[PDB]
Short mmCIF file of C-alpha atoms in Angstrom, two decimals:
data_model
loop_
_atom_site.label_atom_id
_atom_site.label_comp_id
_atom_site.label_asym_id
_atom_site.label_seq_id
_atom_site.Cartn_x
_atom_site.Cartn_y
_atom_site.Cartn_z
CA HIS X 1 28.14 -3.34 -16.62
CA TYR X 2 26.49 -0.09 -16.63
CA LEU X 3 28.54 3.11 -15.77
CA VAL X 4 27.44 6.60 -15.86
CA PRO X 5 28.78 8.53 -18.97
CA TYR X 6 30.83 11.54 -18.07
CA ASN X 7 28.49 13.47 -20.28
CA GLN X 8 25.45 12.46 -18.45
CA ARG X 9 26.49 13.20 -14.85
CA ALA X 10 24.03 16.14 -14.51
CA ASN X 11 21.24 14.28 -16.35
CA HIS X 12 18.36 13.79 -14.15
CA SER X 13 16.64 11.28 -16.29
CA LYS X 14 19.25 8.40 -16.44
CA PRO X 15 18.31 4.84 -15.47
CA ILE X 16 18.74 3.10 -12.12
CA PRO X 17 21.85 0.83 -12.41
CA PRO X 18 20.75 -2.78 -12.93
CA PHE X 19 22.75 -3.96 -9.67
CA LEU X 20 20.32 -1.72 -7.57
CA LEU X 21 16.95 -2.64 -9.48
CA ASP X 22 16.65 -5.65 -7.12
CA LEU X 23 17.81 -5.08 -3.52
CA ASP X 24 17.36 -8.91 -2.91
CA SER X 25 20.57 -10.14 -1.41
CA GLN X 26 19.54 -13.84 -2.18
CA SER X 27 20.36 -13.66 -5.74
CA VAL X 28 23.80 -11.83 -6.20
CA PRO X 29 27.13 -13.69 -6.37
CA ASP X 30 29.03 -14.14 -3.19
CA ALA X 31 31.72 -12.02 -4.85
CA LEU X 32 29.44 -9.00 -5.30
CA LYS X 33 28.01 -8.97 -1.78
CA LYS X 34 28.98 -8.93 1.96
CA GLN X 35 26.45 -10.47 4.25
CA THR X 36 26.35 -10.81 8.10
CA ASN X 37 23.44 -11.34 10.40
CA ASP X 38 23.24 -7.64 10.88
CA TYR X 39 23.44 -6.11 7.45
CA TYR X 40 24.45 -6.72 3.95
CA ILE X 41 26.28 -4.82 1.32
CA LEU X 42 25.83 -4.80 -2.57
CA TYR X 43 28.73 -3.85 -4.53
CA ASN X 44 28.71 -2.24 -8.11
CA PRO X 45 29.71 -4.95 -10.49
CA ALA X 46 31.45 -2.34 -12.86
CA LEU X 47 34.00 -1.14 -10.51
CA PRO X 48 36.96 -2.64 -8.38
CA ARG X 49 35.45 -3.52 -4.93
CA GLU X 50 37.62 -1.23 -2.76
CA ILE X 51 35.91 -0.12 0.31
CA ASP X 52 34.89 -2.37 3.31
CA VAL X 53 32.21 -1.39 5.86
CA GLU X 54 31.57 -2.81 9.17
CA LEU X 55 29.14 -2.34 12.01
CA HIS X 56 30.80 -0.70 15.16
CA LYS X 57 27.93 -0.23 17.52
CA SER X 58 24.29 -0.73 17.38
CA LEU X 59 22.30 1.53 19.85
CA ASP X 60 18.74 0.83 20.89
CA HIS X 61 16.10 3.54 21.20
CA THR X 62 12.74 3.10 22.28
CA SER X 63 11.24 5.12 19.34
CA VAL X 64 12.31 6.12 15.89
CA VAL X 65 15.66 7.93 15.77
CA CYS X 66 15.07 11.16 13.96
CA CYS X 67 18.59 12.49 13.82
CA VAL X 68 22.08 11.61 14.51
CA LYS X 69 25.13 13.92 14.63
CA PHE X 70 28.74 13.87 15.54
CA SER X 71 30.53 16.45 17.74
CA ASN X 72 33.09 18.49 15.75
CA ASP X 73 36.07 16.43 17.07
CA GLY X 74 34.26 13.21 16.05
CA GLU X 75 34.52 11.86 19.66
CA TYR X 76 30.71 11.91 20.35
CA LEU X 77 27.48 11.12 18.81
CA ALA X 78 24.04 12.74 19.82
CA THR X 79 20.82 11.13 18.63
CA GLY X 80 17.35 12.49 19.07
CA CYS X 81 14.12 10.43 19.39
CA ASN X 82 10.82 10.74 21.12
CA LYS X 83 11.15 13.00 24.15
CA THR X 84 14.78 12.21 24.90
CA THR X 85 18.17 13.29 23.37
CA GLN X 86 21.28 11.15 23.95
CA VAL X 87 24.90 11.41 23.89
CA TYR X 88 27.27 8.46 23.19
CA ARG X 89 30.95 8.05 23.32
CA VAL X 90 32.03 6.82 19.84
CA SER X 91 34.97 4.79 20.58
CA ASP X 92 33.27 2.32 22.74
CA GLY X 93 29.53 3.22 22.09
CA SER X 94 28.90 3.88 25.83
CA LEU X 95 26.01 6.20 26.98
CA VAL X 96 27.44 9.45 28.33
CA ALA X 97 24.08 11.08 28.91
CA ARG X 98 20.31 10.97 28.23
CA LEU X 99 18.76 14.50 28.39
CA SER X 100 14.98 14.98 28.94
CA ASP X 101 13.08 18.17 30.03
CA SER X 102 -0.37 15.90 25.74
CA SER X 103 2.23 12.97 25.02
CA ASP X 104 4.88 12.20 22.45
CA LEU X 105 7.26 15.13 21.74
CA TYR X 106 9.93 14.34 19.26
CA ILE X 107 13.28 15.79 19.07
CA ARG X 108 13.58 16.48 15.21
CA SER X 109 17.05 17.96 15.14
CA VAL X 110 20.29 17.99 17.34
CA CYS X 111 23.61 19.78 17.00
CA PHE X 112 26.77 20.19 19.14
CA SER X 113 28.28 23.59 19.47
CA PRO X 114 31.70 23.78 17.87
CA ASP X 115 33.46 23.22 21.24
CA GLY X 116 31.46 20.33 22.12
CA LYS X 117 30.23 21.64 25.43
CA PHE X 118 26.73 22.30 24.28
CA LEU X 119 23.95 20.56 22.44
CA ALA X 120 21.10 22.34 20.72
CA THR X 121 17.82 20.39 20.20
CA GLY X 122 14.68 21.25 18.18
CA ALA X 123 11.44 19.75 19.12
CA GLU X 124 7.89 19.64 18.16
CA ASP X 125 6.89 21.99 20.92
CA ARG X 126 8.51 24.67 18.89
CA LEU X 127 11.19 25.21 21.24
CA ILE X 128 15.04 25.25 20.76
CA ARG X 129 16.85 24.07 23.95
CA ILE X 130 20.63 24.33 24.51
CA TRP X 131 21.89 21.90 26.89
CA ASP X 132 25.01 22.14 28.96
CA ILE X 133 26.23 18.59 28.48
CA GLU X 134 28.60 18.35 31.42
CA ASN X 135 26.16 19.64 33.99
CA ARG X 136 23.09 18.03 32.15
CA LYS X 137 21.14 21.25 32.46
CA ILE X 138 19.18 23.65 29.92
CA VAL X 139 21.05 26.93 29.87
CA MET X 140 18.86 28.62 27.29
CA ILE X 141 15.49 28.27 25.58
CA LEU X 142 14.93 29.88 22.25
CA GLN X 143 11.22 30.95 21.56
CA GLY X 144 9.53 32.20 18.44
CA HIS X 145 8.90 29.51 15.90
CA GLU X 146 5.25 28.63 15.13
CA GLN X 147 5.62 25.11 13.81
CA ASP X 148 7.95 21.96 14.41
CA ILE X 149 11.63 22.76 14.11
CA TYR X 150 13.03 20.37 11.54
CA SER X 151 16.71 21.36 11.57
CA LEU X 152 19.38 23.25 13.29
CA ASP X 153 23.12 24.02 12.75
CA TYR X 154 25.65 26.11 14.63
CA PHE X 155 27.76 28.80 13.08
CA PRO X 156 31.48 28.02 13.25
CA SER X 157 32.08 31.01 15.74
CA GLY X 158 29.73 29.27 18.26
CA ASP X 159 27.67 32.39 19.00
CA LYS X 160 24.91 32.09 16.46
CA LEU X 161 22.48 29.30 15.61
CA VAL X 162 20.36 28.85 12.50
CA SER X 163 16.95 27.03 12.63
CA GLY X 164 14.47 25.68 9.81
CA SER X 165 10.75 25.30 10.57
CA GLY X 166 7.43 24.15 9.07
CA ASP X 167 6.35 27.78 9.87
CA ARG X 168 8.14 28.49 6.61
CA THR X 169 11.02 30.49 8.23
CA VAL X 170 14.66 30.19 8.62
CA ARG X 171 16.05 32.12 11.70
CA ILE X 172 19.29 33.24 13.08
CA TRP X 173 19.83 33.36 16.75
CA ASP X 174 22.20 35.31 18.70
CA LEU X 175 23.40 33.08 21.48
CA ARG X 176 24.96 35.94 23.25
CA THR X 177 21.71 37.96 23.54
CA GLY X 178 19.37 34.82 23.38
CA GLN X 179 17.23 36.74 20.81
CA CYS X 180 16.33 36.15 17.27
CA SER X 181 18.58 38.25 15.14
CA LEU X 182 16.94 37.70 11.80
CA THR X 183 14.01 36.02 10.30
CA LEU X 184 13.98 34.84 6.65
CA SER X 185 10.47 33.99 5.28
CA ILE X 186 9.74 31.79 2.16
CA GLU X 187 6.61 30.41 0.62
CA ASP X 188 6.59 26.71 1.91
CA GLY X 189 8.10 24.81 4.96
CA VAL X 190 11.80 24.54 5.52
CA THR X 191 13.05 21.00 6.15
CA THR X 192 16.69 21.35 6.34
CA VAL X 193 19.46 24.21 6.94
CA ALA X 194 23.13 24.35 6.81
CA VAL X 195 25.95 26.73 7.56
CA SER X 196 28.89 27.12 5.19
CA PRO X 197 32.10 25.75 6.68
CA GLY X 198 35.02 28.07 7.96
CA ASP X 199 33.48 31.62 8.15
CA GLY X 200 29.81 30.69 7.96
CA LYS X 201 29.24 33.30 5.31
CA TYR X 202 26.41 31.54 3.67
CA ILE X 203 23.30 29.64 4.82
CA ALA X 204 21.56 27.20 2.71
CA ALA X 205 17.88 25.90 3.21
CA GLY X 206 16.16 22.95 1.62
CA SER X 207 12.34 23.59 1.04
CA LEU X 208 9.00 21.68 0.38
CA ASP X 209 8.71 23.72 -2.67
CA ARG X 210 11.55 21.74 -4.46
CA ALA X 211 14.12 24.57 -4.24
CA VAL X 212 17.41 25.16 -2.41
CA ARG X 213 18.20 28.75 -1.36
CA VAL X 214 21.49 30.27 -0.20
CA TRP X 215 21.55 33.56 1.64
CA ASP X 216 24.54 35.82 2.61
CA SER X 217 24.35 35.28 6.45
CA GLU X 218 25.21 38.80 7.40
CA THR X 219 22.86 40.65 5.13
CA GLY X 220 19.94 38.04 4.71
CA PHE X 221 20.12 38.55 1.01
CA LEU X 222 19.18 35.66 -1.12
CA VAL X 223 22.30 35.05 -3.21
CA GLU X 224 21.26 31.89 -5.04
CA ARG X 225 18.06 29.93 -5.66
CA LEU X 226 18.31 26.41 -7.10
CA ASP X 227 15.11 25.13 -8.79
CA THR X 228 17.92 19.97 -13.57
CA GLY X 229 16.04 21.00 -10.47
CA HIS X 230 14.44 18.59 -8.03
CA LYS X 231 10.96 17.19 -8.92
CA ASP X 232 9.76 17.00 -5.40
CA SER X 233 10.35 18.32 -1.94
CA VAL X 234 13.98 18.66 -0.60
CA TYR X 235 14.70 17.08 2.64
CA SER X 236 18.39 17.51 3.20
CA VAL X 237 21.14 19.82 2.27
CA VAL X 238 24.84 20.23 3.44
CA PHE X 239 27.72 22.20 1.99
CA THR X 240 30.77 20.37 0.58
CA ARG X 241 33.62 20.74 3.06
CA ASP X 242 35.51 23.17 0.70
CA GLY X 243 32.44 25.39 0.94
CA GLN X 244 32.20 25.45 -2.87
CA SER X 245 29.10 23.43 -3.41
CA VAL X 246 25.86 22.16 -1.84
CA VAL X 247 24.58 18.64 -2.01
CA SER X 248 20.82 17.98 -1.78
CA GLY X 249 18.61 14.96 -1.24
CA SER X 250 14.94 14.83 -2.32
CA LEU X 251 11.82 12.89 -2.30
CA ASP X 252 12.26 12.72 -6.18
CA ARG X 253 14.63 9.88 -5.31
CA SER X 254 17.69 11.77 -6.40
CA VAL X 255 20.74 13.44 -4.82
CA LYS X 256 22.32 16.64 -6.69
CA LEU X 257 25.60 18.42 -6.43
CA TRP X 258 25.29 22.11 -7.04
CA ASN X 259 28.23 24.42 -7.94
CA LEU X 260 27.73 27.91 -6.42
CA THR X 261 24.03 25.24 -11.69
CA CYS X 262 23.59 21.28 -11.16
CA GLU X 263 26.89 19.45 -11.88
CA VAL X 264 25.72 15.96 -10.85
CA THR X 265 22.38 13.99 -10.35
CA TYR X 266 23.15 10.72 -8.56
CA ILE X 267 20.51 8.21 -9.51
CA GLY X 268 20.10 4.92 -7.72
CA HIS X 269 17.76 5.18 -4.77
CA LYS X 270 14.32 3.42 -5.22
CA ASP X 271 12.55 5.72 -2.67
CA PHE X 272 12.58 8.93 -0.94
CA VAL X 273 16.11 10.35 -0.16
CA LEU X 274 16.04 11.60 3.31
CA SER X 275 19.54 12.51 4.27
CA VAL X 276 22.86 13.34 2.64
CA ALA X 277 26.43 13.94 3.93
CA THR X 278 29.83 14.12 2.63
CA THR X 279 33.02 12.31 3.70
CA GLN X 280 36.49 14.12 4.35
CA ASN X 281 38.05 15.77 1.25
CA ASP X 282 34.59 15.28 -0.29
CA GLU X 283 35.76 12.18 -2.06
CA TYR X 284 32.33 10.43 -1.39
CA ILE X 285 28.65 11.43 -0.82
CA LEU X 286 26.58 9.29 1.37
CA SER X 287 22.72 9.23 1.13
CA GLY X 288 20.10 7.59 3.41
CA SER X 289 16.82 6.51 2.05
CA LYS X 290 13.34 5.39 2.76
CA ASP X 291 14.48 2.24 0.77
CA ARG X 292 16.23 1.28 4.01
CA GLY X 293 19.69 1.69 2.41
CA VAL X 294 22.68 3.95 2.32
CA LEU X 295 24.48 4.62 -0.84
CA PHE X 296 28.04 5.55 -1.21
CA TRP X 297 28.69 7.73 -4.22
CA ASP X 298 31.90 8.59 -5.95
CA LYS X 299 31.26 12.43 -5.94
CA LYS X 300 32.99 13.19 -9.09
CA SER X 301 31.55 10.58 -11.63
CA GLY X 302 28.08 10.13 -9.95
CA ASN X 303 28.63 6.20 -10.00
CA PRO X 304 27.26 4.46 -6.88
CA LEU X 305 29.94 2.51 -5.23
CA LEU X 306 27.98 0.21 -2.85
CA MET X 307 24.59 0.03 -1.25
CA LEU X 308 24.57 -0.73 2.53
CA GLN X 309 21.31 -2.31 3.76
CA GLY X 310 21.75 -2.14 7.50
CA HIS X 311 18.34 -1.34 8.99
CA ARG X 312 14.86 -2.85 8.83
CA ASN X 313 13.25 0.51 8.03
CA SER X 314 13.93 3.97 6.64
CA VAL X 315 17.27 5.59 7.15
CA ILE X 316 16.22 8.97 8.40
CA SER X 317 19.42 10.61 9.07
CA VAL X 318 23.01 10.06 8.02
CA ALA X 319 26.14 11.73 9.76
CA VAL X 320 29.70 11.60 8.90
CA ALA X 321 32.41 12.17 11.55
CA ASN X 322 35.40 14.23 11.50
CA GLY X 323 38.71 13.30 13.03
CA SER X 324 39.36 9.45 13.67
CA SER X 325 38.20 8.16 17.09
CA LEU X 326 38.49 4.56 15.94
CA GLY X 327 42.11 4.91 14.68
CA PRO X 328 43.77 6.54 11.49
CA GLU X 329 42.67 3.49 9.47
CA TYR X 330 39.00 4.18 9.72
CA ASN X 331 36.31 6.69 8.68
CA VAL X 332 33.47 6.76 10.86
CA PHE X 333 29.69 7.63 9.77
CA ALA X 334 26.33 7.11 11.55
CA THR X 335 22.75 6.27 10.69
CA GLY X 336 19.46 6.81 12.46
CA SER X 337 16.52 4.75 11.50
CA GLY X 338 12.78 4.31 11.74
CA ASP X 339 13.69 0.79 12.96
CA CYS X 340 14.53 2.54 16.36
CA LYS X 341 18.27 1.87 16.18
CA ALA X 342 21.21 4.27 15.60
CA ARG X 343 24.35 2.47 14.20
CA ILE X 344 27.85 3.60 14.23
CA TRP X 345 29.83 2.34 11.05
CA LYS X 346 33.56 2.23 10.29
CA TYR X 347 34.82 1.81 6.64
CA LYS X 348 38.29 1.52 5.04
CA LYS X 349 40.03 0.97 1.64
CA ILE X 350 40.98 -2.66 0.86
#
């Protein structure tokens, strides 16, 4: 059974592992797959089936779920869809709040403030709204973008926010003064932004032009430009939790690990890669794709460990939780799909 040679990890042109060439679950041995009425998992036949994945809660939405994100403490999940943004209690999946301010205005991105009291949302009306969750009221509106806001992320300090837009800019907002402190302009649309963990010294942005850019957040100077580069638009980027690398997902169907140079190109998805995230300690990389699956990757070797098929349409967003709201024996992650459902999953080592 195929395995990625340690010498070809960075190699962009390796083949799709045979066990992923056909996502059909009605042909693989009962020993290489886990099936339930709600989802099925395909395991890599070349490795020891370790990890078990289970569905914790399935949350109905009346429109495509564009984004999912956990609060810093891992106790809450916020989803964004058409017109409404919602907050759910992770432990029991209960609805804590549904926030709502031409027809059809999708909430493209959501993000909790570090202390979990506020929720920032980016919509197609070009506005960024900051919601006081407790009192269900908008406490600040950030205006300035000239196109849809595709991504938002808070600085660890909680007094600044970064946004990415189709207007080709990345903006840093001062939440103390409610003003735009800095505007970075590039050549094409910005699809995703991320703040480095800890001090928030760096900001990364994925772009329609196939590149990933990293700026020094205080000066606005471009420190790195990665473009082994992707062959199509980048749709998602996050920093590894150690703040040393960047992980990017692209429409070219690959995920890439960049050392702040491309160390690993994970090959396996059969369609657009739309979202990436890393688990604690960065042991695994999770990717959501238009192929309706979520792949778990061993970060170091680049080998795909298992494919989770738990949606009837594109996995648009993937988020991983910190802490352990479901017990010390579980790790939690969530998916937002075009099938109008947001699911909370729990996984463990067997």
